[PDB]
RNA sequence: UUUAAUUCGAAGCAACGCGAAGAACCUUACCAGGCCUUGACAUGCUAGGGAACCCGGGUGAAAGCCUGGGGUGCCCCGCGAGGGGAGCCCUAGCACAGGUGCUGCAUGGCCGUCGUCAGCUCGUGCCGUGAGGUGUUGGGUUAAGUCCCGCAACGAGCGCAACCCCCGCCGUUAGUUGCCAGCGGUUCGGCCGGGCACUCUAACGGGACUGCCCGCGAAAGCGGGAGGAAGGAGGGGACGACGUCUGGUCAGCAUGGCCCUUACGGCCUGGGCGACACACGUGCUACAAUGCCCACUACAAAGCGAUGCCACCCGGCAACGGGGAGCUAAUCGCAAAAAGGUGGGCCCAGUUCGGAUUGGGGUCUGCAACCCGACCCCUGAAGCCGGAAUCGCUAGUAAUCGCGGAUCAGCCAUGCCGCG
């Protein structure tokens, strides 16, 4: 857990933000399953990619804190 | 698996390193490096002039190199010319200026890199091998040698299957300490790839 | 034991200081 | 009040500059408190003998940085003037403070 | 501080918030398996029972 | 993936970390210890020729 | 006045200094059983002492470095009659019987690759 | 082992009773080097045997360790398909041996749980002819005479 | 087994904490997807431009693709127009590079291993039709084909041993940053004078040889004794015969041959090598009272460090953070050594044993700790000494206790190599 930033891409950080001038679609590929999760941007489904696919995760304020790439399993069944 | 290089086994005692200069953790990485590609480009340029040795010593921070070939006469030129380059080559390289010298390396057939070489040289130019080694066996004794090994790897003839042919004279105590026991490795590469050639050097104790 | 990070011994093994080693 | 620190691999050929680096210091007048050994540091370098396989079998390399104090403890100029120009260094290396 | 039950409640709480979405240590809890890193090739005996030894190998024939 | 691999480790490149040691005669990449910026087998092969200045088989 | 012996044993080092009095021992400026506090073995220390007598009739101002309390111990029993014998010279005849006057040669063995610990091996499996 | 007999080792005697038999005694209490401990859980113990007796421990030490001594032991030897426990003698060396080891061992099956009232009570015990160590050596002339019989290949 | 991938090799001993002395990205050889092609790298030829260099603009996850600028030192026609010019850099074309793709029965080099076992040979002589034998079968003795005796053999070589390093006793040289015995002074720590005596440091030497004594023996040797710090090879290293194993390694490197050429080459972002129903090897921590916790108090050695070791303050329960000396380091630092000793607490309990697992809240490294880092601070699993079996060790050894290092930003090190 880093403590001065959140570390959050801007690549990111930007196609979510410019988002907010009124709200619009989701075609909204990334990579960066580094990046945090950021409040407000609840509504934003996100397709981050783990490994071989990119993998549509719908957001929500109960996962703020957490990382894109933990509701994006890299490895399949156990 | 096994023998010691002979030359490591001796380095304090007996024998001598190829390069003494003295640096700290900061430097040696570097100066390291430049011995290297100093030897390097020596090791190919002076092929024909048959180099034993290339002893680098390095003071005010200024570096001199002693080249100890059989054939000066090669790595001089007609007046020194090649000798010129060699000098102005070395400074190209490395940013620094550079001492080069020659030492005719006296009796050629006591030394091991040179009766290695004369043998794989041969071995490259399809003589037999059985013979080549024990004639270069009879030249370092008839040169005075207290005893001489030497050794061809494997693929001799161009066989398929890889041997290793050996032969040897005189005494070539490699447990003891105190020999002096110069050795020597060249490759012969081959249309059927190589052979490394190992020769032994016993020239006398304390 | 050594296992146990709340402890003095935990603490020398892992090779660390905290509540439980305090650095002298 | 000058302290040279001489630093060498091969110990026989430091106390062989020691020794010179005296020598010539007496021989300008100045006192010189003899060359004292100080202790060495050494670096161990301890590597696999086999390029693959075998972790067991492996081989110990040292690599012995010796070191020698001289104080010349009252100096002339005429001190000064054999060392910092009558040289004889190969694979040793001085270093001045005072 | 709370503290036995109250306290057994938030943990409990914590963890099936941890379902949610479902985050890699979400899964884990459900599956059973160790959520910090761990290694589960050779042990985790603790967060799985002791062993079911389901086993059947042993080399080619001729 | 070799001699591109000697090349890419010379480069120094976006975030200090992603740089490593690499042997400077075997292109290795392990074992390469920083004093003599070498290999464990480059190092060994130089050791025993004398080629380490100072550098001896070590015995106690 | 002042009669010396050097003692050493397993990395430790005992200067020992022996003089006439009452029978006080001193180790790094502490009493002997401040300093030894403890240590079933340290009486050791003096058994050369026993051995001419002469235990009381001496003062000794000894300091020890490197090792551990018993080697420093052993260290101090060598310096000890090396001191002595060295103010008498025939306290040697009846010091030898005892080993008194030997070293100790015995030290911690090298590491050794390949062991775990100079002999203790990596356990072998086989199958 | 296979050259020579192998030279036995002298221990140094005892600081307090100056016996050669008591460091061998502590020599068995001792664990990891830990000999102060030994040492000073062997002394403890005597001073149990004052509390518990105007006895010297040294003379009732010296008694228990008689007294679990054995006079023969079964010795495994092999015929070449079946195998027999041979009654035999036991050495001088052996039976001191066997005897601080039984001791020792047999103090730490009791049930108090300082270490020096163990040593002291099951020293007590065996010099009183009749402890765990005892039975330990009683066991093993009772495993010899169980075996009198085969001691006819006497090795 | 699974997976998109879980790169690859090692396979009884002699594969399995092994290559790996450091996998989040890098590494990295694998997977996915996005990109590049005379190429990330080399040697050289042709040609319009450009010819060093350096800066932002779009589009991107990044590579990349597209972009627009600052702006020619140099050889030289020269007082200039203008104009030759070599480095050097981009565009296209030509040769070529690149391949951790295959083969360790095509190889070199290096390594393992039998085995530090006591062997393996040769020259001449002699024996035998010959392969071959003797020598080197025998008796004694040794750690040893070590030595002695004997003998159709007399010698020699590779091995053994010795010559090399460490440790143990002492001497000479040297006296700072190391030491402090006797002084003198003193803000106590050798702090100042002094001094190098002792300790050290480290370089050169001495010293052990069955030399001396007793016994046995034909001898070599053996048993014992004395002296000596040390004996009977003083204790450890380094050191590995002729050969064996179609041993290991084409993935360290080199290398013959085979194969790939807008891809089997090259760049990136992300994933993976960390998967888990199982099985095995090596370890660590344990099950406790010879113990456990807390306080206090000691006694090491070998290493490491000037973009690093960090004293000492302060804040913080703390990881750590702010300050901030000293140290090119026998100077200053990492450094607390732990076990030990002294106090006190626990009172036989799945416990004040044990610290797994899990929840939270912090710290640090780094572009970034989701997969996957370590550390700190507030749940308490199994485990009551382990079946068949099986390993290590003969003395400062085992056992136990800590310390350091390489790699390394950090670290999954409980590993390794060392130190006591
Ligand atoms: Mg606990
Ligand atoms: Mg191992
Ligand atoms: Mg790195
Ligand atoms: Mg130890
Ligand atoms: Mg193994
Ligand atoms: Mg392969
Ligand atoms: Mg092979
Ligand atoms: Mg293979
Ligand atoms: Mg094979
Ligand atoms: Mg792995
Ligand atoms: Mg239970
Ligand atoms: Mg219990």
């Keep these: 857990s880093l403590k001065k930033g959140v570390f959050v891409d801007d690549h990111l950080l930007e196609k979510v933000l410019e988002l907010n001038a009124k709200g619009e679609k989701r075609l909204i590929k990334t990579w960066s399953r580094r990046s945090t999760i950021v409040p407000e941007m609840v509504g934003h489904t996100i397709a981050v990619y783990n490994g071989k696919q990119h993998v549509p995760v719908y957001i929500t304020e109960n996962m703020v804190g957490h990382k894109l790439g933990e509701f994006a399993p890299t490895r399949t069944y156990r | 698996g096994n023998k010691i290089h002979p030359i490591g086994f001796r380095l304090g005692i007996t024998r001598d390193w190829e390069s003494r200069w003295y640096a700290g953790k900061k430097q040696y990485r570097h100066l390291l490096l430049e011995d290297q590609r100093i030897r390097g480009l020596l090791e190919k340029e002076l092929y024909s002039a048959g180099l034993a040795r290339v002893d680098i010593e390095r003071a005010a921070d200024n570096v001199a190199v002693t080249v100890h070939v059989a054939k000066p006469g090669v790595v001089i030129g007609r007046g020194g010319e090649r000798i010129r380059v060699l000098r102005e080559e070395l400074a190209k390289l490395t940013g620094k200026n550079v001492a080069l010298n020659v030492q005719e390396v006296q009796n050629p057939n006591l030394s091991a890199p040179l009766v290695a070489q004369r043998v794989a040289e041969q071995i490259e130019r399809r003589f037999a091998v059985r013979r080549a080694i024990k004639q270069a066996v009879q030249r370092v004794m008839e040169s005075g040698a207290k005893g001489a090994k030497v050794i061809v790897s494997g693929r001799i003839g161009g066989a398929e299957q890889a041997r290793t042919e050996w032969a040897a004279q005189g005494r070539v105590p490699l447990h003891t300490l105190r020999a002096n026991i110069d050795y020597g490795f060249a490759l012969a590469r081959t249309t059927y790839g190589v052979l490394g050639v190992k020769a032994y050097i016993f020239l006398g104790e304390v | 034991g050594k296992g146990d990070r709340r402890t003095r011994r935990g603490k020398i093994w892992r090779g660390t200081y905290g509540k439980y080693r305090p650095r002298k | 009040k000058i302290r040279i620190k001489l630093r060498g691999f091969d110990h026989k050929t430091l106390d062989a500059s020691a020794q010179k680096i005296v020598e010539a210091a007496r021989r300008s007048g100045a006192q010189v408190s003899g060359p004292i050994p100080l202790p060495t540091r050494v670096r161990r370098f301890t590597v696999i003998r086999g390029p693959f396989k075998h972790k067991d079998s492996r081989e110990h390399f040292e690599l012995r940085t010796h070191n020698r104090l001289v104080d010349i403890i009252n100096p002339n100029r005429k001190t000064i003037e054999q060392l910092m120009t009558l040289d004889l260094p190969t694979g040793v290396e001085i270093e001045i403070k005072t | ?62 | 993936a070799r001699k591109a691999l000697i090349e890419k480790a010379k480069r120094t490149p976006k975030f200090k970390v992603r740089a490593y040691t690499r042997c400077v005669r075997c292109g290795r990449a392990r074992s390469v210890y920083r004093f003599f910026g070498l290999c464990r087998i480059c190092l060994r092969e130089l050791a025993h020729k004398g080629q380490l200045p100072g550098v001896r088989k070590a015995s106690w | 006045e002042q009669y010396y012996g050097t003692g050493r044993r397993k990395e430790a080092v005992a200067r020992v200094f022996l003089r006439p009095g009452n029978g006080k021992v001193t180790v790094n400026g502490q009493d002997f059983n401040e300093y030894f506090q403890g240590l079933v073995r340290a009486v050791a220390a003096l058994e050369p002492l026993r051995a001419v007598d002469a235990l009381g009739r001496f003062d000794a101002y000894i300091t020890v470095r490197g090792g551990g309390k018993s080697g420093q111990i052993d260290a101090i029993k060598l310096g000890i009659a090396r001191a002595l014998v060295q103010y008498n010279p025939d306290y040697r005849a009846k010091l030898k019987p005892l080993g008194f006057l030997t070293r100790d040669a015995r030290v911690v063995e090298r590491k050794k690759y390949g062991k775990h610990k100079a002999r203790r091996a990596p356990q072998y499996s086989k199958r | 082992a296979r050259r020579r007999r192998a030279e036995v080792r002298q221990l140094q005697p005892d600081l307090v009773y100056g016996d050669v038999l008591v460091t061998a005694f502590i020599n068995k209490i001792m664990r990891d080097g830990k000999k102060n401990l030994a040492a000073r859980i062997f002394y403890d113990a005597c001073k149990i045997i004052q509390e518990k007796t105007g006895q010297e421990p040294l003379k009732v030490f010296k008694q228990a360790v008689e007294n679990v001594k054995p006079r023969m032991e079964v010795r495994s030897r092999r015929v070449g398909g079946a195998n027999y426990q041979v009654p035999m003698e036991v050495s001088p060396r052996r039976q001191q041996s066997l005897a601080l080891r039984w001791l020792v061992q047999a103090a730490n099956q009791r049930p108090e749980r300082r270490a020096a009232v163990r040593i002291a009570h099951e020293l007590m015990d065996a010099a009183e002819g009749k402890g765990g160590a005892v039975k330990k050596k009683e066991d093993v002339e009772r495993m010899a005479e169980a075996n009198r019989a085969y001691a006819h290949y006497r090795w």
């Design chain 5, 1 to 62: 501080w709370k503290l036995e039950g109250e306290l057994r409640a938030e943990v409990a709480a914590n963890i099936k918030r941890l379902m949610d979405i479902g985050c890699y240590r979400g899964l884990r809890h459900r599956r059973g398996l160790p959520v910090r890193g761990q290694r589960t090739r050779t042990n985790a005996r603790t967060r799985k029972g002791p062993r079911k030894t389901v086993a059947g190998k042993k080399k080619a024939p001729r």
